[PDB]
Write a protein that binds this DNA or RNA. Structure first.
Lengths: 52, 139, 171, 150, 149, 126
RNA sequence: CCCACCCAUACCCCGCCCUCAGGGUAGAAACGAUGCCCUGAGGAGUAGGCGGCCGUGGAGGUCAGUGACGAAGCCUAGGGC
RNA sequence: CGGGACCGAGGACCGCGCUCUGCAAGGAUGCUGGCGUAAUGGUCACCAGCGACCCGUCUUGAAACACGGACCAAGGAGUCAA
RNA sequence: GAGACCGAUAGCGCACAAGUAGAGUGAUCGAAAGAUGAAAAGCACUUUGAAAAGAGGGUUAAAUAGCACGUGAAAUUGUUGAAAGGGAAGCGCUUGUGACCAGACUUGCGCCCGGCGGAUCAUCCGGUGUUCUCACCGGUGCACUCCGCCGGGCUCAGGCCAG
């Protein structure tokens, strides 16, 4: 049971990777390259009004 | 900025959802990929200017990327359906691919794909019957 | 159930089976090979003679360090024996097949043993006691027997070749 | 059989970066094109130092840059294929134009507060494609715990 | 092979069997060839031997590569600063042993000859004067060049 | 259709490389295993023994992965898979996967017949 | 002593494979640039060192994947790479 | 000036040249016949000519000796932590 | 309550009437062993046998699932078919014979005539979209212009072995 199960990651690297994934989510070629059906999406990034 | 077609190619050159890798070659399922080959020349979703041809009920249907609407996928494609003579379709596709500098390197591939689709839309011929050969197959 | 000889149709043939039969597999194989391909009545008479020690079954494969007899000269061998128990079991199976043929309506006197096959059954596991407090197997080797009785019963030539043959046909 | 007393030697130098950074790959492509299509040995040295690893790219401080900026180098563009770090011991940062792989936040802020310019290597390749009027600097390679323990 | 004849053969660029080279006669080269006499056969070649060797099996060393001598442009690019701009210039330099014999002979890649037609003598590894093939056979090397080329 | 023009297909060796003593032992599969004993005749390459595979047996780069018709096999599972060979009917031949049902096989065969694409196993499940 | 002839994985010429080395390839009609094109040399191997690929159980993503009109497994003097 | 064998790599043009309407000059074309199928090719079984010790393992420098192996299926041995 | 654990030689010794059966004076030691089928629908009735069972004939979607029961490998064995064998077989290279096979091919493309069926031929006008000069759509063709089909002829390219 004392195998090393958990990996400690720097919080700066976690925040870097989260920002990189957020930036990649605004690129529509990468959305299609990840297998998403976004051909009918009017705009990327898709923003919906908070009243809905 | 931080995003370019070169960057998208460096990101998705090893793996993407369109990739079909086998022993005898690597193919692409991309709709904007002429000849369905995994390369920077033919990666339509990577390239800013890109062309793609799909079959229609009669004729071809050609989609092209609009550079001013890259972030608007619903209005990112300029679509023309060619339902006319094959020569007129080839002329219009070649003009669309070469006259204004919109991927003149894809002109031959686009004309070839249009010709292949229009030839596949023709009726097939009946095959000659299989002839039994030898002794065990014949008897 | 499936027989090994699947080519034989069941319309004009009669079959018989016996399984887990506590008789010697080697002796039964020799007896079945002795009566293979024979007429039914000839096989029955020969097996009765084997029981009566009047005719002998030749021992061909399972014959190591057996005895020699004068009754093997009809078979061209010297080693032959009289497996009475195997003869009795095969007589029972042959009479069952004859009854099957009579039920089917075939001609009994025009039947030959087209197929007969003896296979090893799962072995009977007894134990025997030896010296120095040892125990060894004392197994029996039984057999499955099955049998079926049936009624006894110029292209792509060359132009030169064609011209030669036409000229020889004319001449 | 051919008598080969001497042995043909495979290359003992990096021909490609081991890093998987896509932006570094783009920089390597750009400077491969420059080193193939130009006379300048500056582009070849910069492509080499882009191939190099991190222990082979020690950091360069603003105080080291200010030391090398003396004696007629006050107008040369400083090129460092490494990380540029800030030095607290340098109280007055002079005005300088530095191109680097990356800057620390304090070094970039102090350069821009002194009034100089910070550039990336692609901006450097755009503005000085032949490396004209440039001061090429390296950090202390042997200033490491391992090298001291060698 | 002992280390000293091995080193002399490596310096004479005779690193394979049936390799041939041109040597200018000095004492400094003559002593080397006399030491490696138990492995080589050498002699005085005529103009026909020189021109057949250069025309048929002529290869130049260009940037460390073995290039066939099929055009005079290669000779002009590689030996033009010494006045050798053609294959006849190269043949004349080698045959007459001119002032640029070192450069011409080093530009010539070592000749890779075939085995002789008609074979060697019955006992090949003896000296020429004793009925073998080794050593200095003087003008008789031309028949060996005809057989091996 | 007919394949693209190519150089003649040369196989330097058509026989397989059989494992040593796999002929004499049933527990040894015939698939190649390199002998590692120091006194092995095959590993030491005595004459009259089994040959050992090497890169000198490699096939011509222009005709590698070519079937005798000159095509390269591409495994297909459906109609969208076989439509990827629209531009490669002179170089690639479709090959239906073994676990594809008969109805989908008829659909793939019909689509490949329309596209002019050779199917290597078109007679299956008929 | 002389002439002719036999043949080694040795030598010569040609093809093909791999390795190494040297070049070219963007005001891109442009490329699995981790590609392609051109040229040359080399090829045995125990201990030992290094690189790349094949296969098995399971996990995330993906192929709008295969499947009772038959998945997995098994047998096969049947074929392809 | 003849006689024979083996080979035909490349794939628009560019070059060096010549005997210069063209060419044997930076790698084969032209003409013709039979057949269009098991004919070529391939797999398996067997005969024939030549070739060919039974594998690890151990020892030292090496052999020999020695030790393990009737056969088949499934496990089965450089892992984890500091 | 869960798991990037194991999937009946694994995982606890134990998925089963398992700390059971069994061994030992005793302290103690200590297994093997899961799966028919959706449903027993687990074969009526006839016939041969002393019986076990066999054969017909039903049941099932399947008995090639018969309480030896899902799938059913190998060692090893029986039958049938083919073959070899004068004190070993087995293997490598290369033919040959016999047996058995995978490919390839069946025609494509381009012209010149003749006969049909149609006007998504060129130009012009309007609308729309775009790469801003290119297209599509709607009216215009009135058949020496485009697109399909069928008969003939010609050229070229097509498979195997060869001179």
């Amino acid at each position: 049971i004392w195998r090393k199960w958990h990996v400690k990651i720097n919080q700066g690297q976690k925040r870097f990777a989260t920002a990189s994934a957020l930036a990649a989510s605004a690129v529509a070629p990468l959305l299609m390259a990840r297998g998403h059906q976004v051909s009918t999406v009017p705009e990327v990034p898709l923003v919906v009004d908070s009243a809905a | 900025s931080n995003v370019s077609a070169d960057l998208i190619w460096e990101v998705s050159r090893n793996y993407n959802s369109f990739l079909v890798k086998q022993r005898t070659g690597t193919f692409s399922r991309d709709a904007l990929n002429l000849t369905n080959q995994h390369s920077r020349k033919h990666a339509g979703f990577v390239n800013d200017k890109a062309l793609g041809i799909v079959p229609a009920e009669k004729g071809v249907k050609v989609i092209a990327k609009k550079v001013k609407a890259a972030n608007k996928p619903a209005s990112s494609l300029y679509t023309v359906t060619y339902k006319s003579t094959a020569r007129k379709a080839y002329k219009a596709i070649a003009s669309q691919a070469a006259k204004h500098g919109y991927r003149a390197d894809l002109r031959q591939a686009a004309v070839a794909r249009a010709s292949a689709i229009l030839r596949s839309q023709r009726p097939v011929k009946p095959e000659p019957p299989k002839k039994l050969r030898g002794a065990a197959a014949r008897r | 159930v499936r027989y090994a000889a699947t080519e034989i149709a069941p319309t004009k043939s009669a079959r018989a089976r016996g399984s887990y039969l506590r008789v010697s597999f080697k002796n039964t194989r020799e007896t079945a090979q002795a009566i293979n391909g024979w007429k039914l009545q000839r096989a029955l008479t020969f097996l009765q003679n084997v029981i009566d020690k009047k005719e002998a079954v030749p021992m061909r494969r399972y014959a190591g360090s057996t005895g020699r007899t004068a009754q093997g000269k009809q078979w061209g061998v010297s080693r032959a024996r009289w497996p009475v128990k195997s003869a009795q079991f095969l007589i029972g199976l042959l009479k069952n097949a004859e009854a099957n043929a009579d039920a089917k309506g075939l001609d009994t006197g025009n039947l030959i043993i087209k197929h007969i096959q003896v296979n090893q059954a799962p072995k009977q596991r007894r134990r025997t006691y030896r010296a120095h407090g040892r125990i060894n197997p004392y197994m029996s080797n039984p057999c499955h027997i099955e049998l079926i009785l049936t009624e006894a019963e110029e292209s792509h030539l060359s132009s030169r070749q064609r011209g030669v043959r036409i000229r020889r046909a004319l001449t | 059989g051919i008598d080969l007393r001497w042995k043909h030697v495979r290359s003992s130098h990096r021909k490609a970066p081991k890093s998987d950074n896509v932006y570094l790959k783009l920089l390597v492509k750009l400077y491969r094109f420059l080193a193939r299509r130009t006379e300048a040995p500056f582009n070849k040295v910069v492509l080499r130092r882009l191939f190099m690893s991190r222990i082979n790219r020690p950091p360069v401080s603003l105080s080291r840059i200010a030391r090398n900026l003396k004696n007629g180098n006050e107008k040369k563009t400083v090129v460092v294929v490494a990380t540029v770090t800030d030095d607290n011991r340098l109280l007055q940062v002079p005005k300088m134009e530095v191109a680097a792989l990356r800057f620390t936040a304090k070094a970039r802020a102090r350069i821009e507060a002194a009034g100089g310019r910070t550039l990336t290597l692609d901006q450097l390749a755009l503005e000085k494609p032949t490396g004209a009027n440039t001061l090429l600097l390296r950090g202390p390679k042997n200033a490491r715990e391992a090298v001291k323990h060698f | 092979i002992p280390p000293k004849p091995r080193k002399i053969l490596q310096l004479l660029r005779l690193r394979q069997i049936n390799n041939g080279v041109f040597v200018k006669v000095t004492k400094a080269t003559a002593e080397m060839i006399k030491i490696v006499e138990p492995w080589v056969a050498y002699g005085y070649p005529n103009l026909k031997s020189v021109r057949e060797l250069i025309y048929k099996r002529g290869y130049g060393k260009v940037n460390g590569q073995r290039i066939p001598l099929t055009d005079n442009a290669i000779i002009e690019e590689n030996l033009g600063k010494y006045g050798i701009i053609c294959i006849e210039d190269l043949i004349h330099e080698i045959f007459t042993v001119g002032p640029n014999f070192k450069q011409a002979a080093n530009f010539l890649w070592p000749f890779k000859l075939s085995n002789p037609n008609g074979g060697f003598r019955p006992r090949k590894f003896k000296h020429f004067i004793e009925g073998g093939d080794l050593g200095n056979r003087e003008e008789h090397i031309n028949a060996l060049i005809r057989a091996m080329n | 259709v007919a394949a693209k023009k190519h150089v003649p297909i040369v196989k330097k060796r058509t026989k397989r490389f059989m494992r040593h003593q796999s002929d004499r032992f049933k527990c040894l599969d015939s698939a190649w295993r390199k002998p590692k004993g120091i006194d092995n005749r095959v590993r030491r390459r005595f004459k009259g023994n089994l040959a050992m595979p090497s890169i000198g047996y490699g096939s011509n780069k222009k005709t590698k992965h070519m079937m005798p018709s000159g095509h390269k096999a591409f495994l297909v599972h459906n109609v969208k898979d076989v439509e990827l060979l629209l531009m490669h009917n002179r170089t690639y031949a479709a090959e239906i996967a073994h676990n594809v049902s008969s109805r989908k096989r008829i659909d793939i065969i019909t689509r490949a017949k329309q596209l002019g694409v050779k199917v290597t196993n078109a007679k299956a499940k008929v």
